[PDB]
Design a protein around this ligand. Structure first.
Ligand SMILES: COc1ccc(S(=O)(=O)N(CC(C)C)C[C@@H](O)[C@H](Cc2ccccc2)NC(=O)O[C@H]2CO[C@H]3O[C@@H]4OCC[C@@H]4[C@H]32)cc1
Ligand SMILES: [Cl-]
Lengths: 99, 99
């Protein structure tokens, strides 16, 4: 699809068998999701934005569907104000910016 | 152009007679630039992100040239760790996300 930017580019994702809403975010290197449970071991990461850094849990090789497109990759979990799909998964679904 | 997302989508902008590098950021409602002078009146605003909020100056009706494409709109100025072109200006240059 072609997503215009007059509104927030919110899509439905599926992770852990559950549907959630998330923002397609070209300004995010990484994908960050609100607190949830994911399987396996995690590694620490600190990520930074407007307002400062937060600590998150890094889970690798997680199966995630993004707007109906299948991806498998790294998901950071922590106290983000928004679920954001960053470039590590936008590249897996073949997304580009065009003007 | 078509911009892939393997790397950060950084572009050159011209704002207030200055050249800057900025990120094309579909996850940002608003355009946020590091400290600089702009003409006209302004009003204070708090904007959030990962890590919390920062205080910025909101300037309206600012002309920006983004990778060669001119646009007018609101610019927030303050202690952002990255110059960000948000949706308020991305719409004006006709940018879409495609997959
Ligand atoms: C290493 O991997 C990362 C590292 C950092 C980030 S991030 O979330 O800090 N961010 C990086 C960017 C600031 C350089 C991604 C942005 O797209 C965030 C994404 C974001 C969205 C919502 C809340 C937090 C973050 N947007 C954001 O800060 O927008 C600001 C400006 O306009 C407003 O719109 C947004 O909605 C209203 C609040 C924000 C305001 C993500 C993944
Ligand atoms: Cl062109």
């Amino acid at each position: 699809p072609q997503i215009t930017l007059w509104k927030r580019p919110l899509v439905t994702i599926k992770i852990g068998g559950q549907l959630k809403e998330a923002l397609l975010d070209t300004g995010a290197d990484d994908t960050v999701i609100e607190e949830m449970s994911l399987p396996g071991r995690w590694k620490p990461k600190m990520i930074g934005g407007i307002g400062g850094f937060i600590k998150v849990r890094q889970y690798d090789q997680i199966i995630i569907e993004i707007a109906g497109h299948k991806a498998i990759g790294t998901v950071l979990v922590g106290p983000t104000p928004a679920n954001i799909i960053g470039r590590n998964l936008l590249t897996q679904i073949g997304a580009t910016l065009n003007f």
